Amino acid sequence: AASHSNVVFPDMSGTALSWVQKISGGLGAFAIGAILVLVVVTCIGLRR
Amino acid sequence: VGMSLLALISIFASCYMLVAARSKCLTPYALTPGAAVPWTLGILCCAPRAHA
């Protein structure tokens, strides 16, 4: 019989979760940049 | 109870001072038919959002 507690979810520092973190970080940086562009544009538009 | 009450008193005093400073800075602009200086409008929020 198995000698472990049979838990499978890996650590957030594992290779798979490192890849997921990197991809999510890239997409989040893109989204934050787009938010900043929209905010700057709308503030300039409202200041007129 | 004493510490909580003192903290609430201090935070209320600071908020009142900010509101009073805002009112004192933006009071002369409602006594003229002039503009509100959007530079100051951005930092100092006022009731007229778009009008005047």
Task: Explain what the structure shows.
- The structure is cut from a larger assembly and holds chains A (about 50 residues) and B (about 50 residues).
- By secondary structure, chain A is mostly helical.
- Chain A contains 1 helix and no strands.
- Chain B has 2 helices and no strands.
- Chain B has helices at about 1-25, 40-45.
- The PDB classes it as viral protein.
- Keywords: Semliki Forest virus, vldlr, viral protein.
- Semliki Forest virus viron in complex with VLDLR.
Could you name the key traits of this structure?
part of a larger assembly; 2 chains; A: 48 residues; mainly alpha; 1 helix; 69% helix; B: 52 residues; viral protein; Semliki Forest virus
Summarize the structure.
This is part of a larger assembly, with chains A (48 residues) and B (52 residues). Chain A has 48 residues and is mainly α. Chain A is built from one helix and no strands.
What series of H and E elements makes up the topology of chain A? H
Which class do the helix and strand fractions of chain A yield?
A: mainly alpha
Helix content of chain B: 55-70%
Please report the total strand number of chain B as a whole number.
0
| Large-scale geometry of chain A | rod-shaped
Number of β-strand runs of chain A = 0
Question: First CA to last CA of chain B: what distance?
Answer: 47 Å
Strand content of chain A: under 5%
Structural class of chain B: mainly alpha
Largest sheet of chain B: none
Radius of gyration of chain A: 21 Å
Order of helices and strands of chain B: HH
Total DSSP helices of chain A: 1
- Strand fraction of chain B equals under 5%
Radius of gyration of chain B: 16 Å
Tertiary shape of chain B: elongated
PDB class: viral protein
Keywords: Semliki Forest virus, vldlr, viral protein
Entry title: Semliki Forest virus viron in complex with VLDLR
Chain A: Spike glycoprotein E1
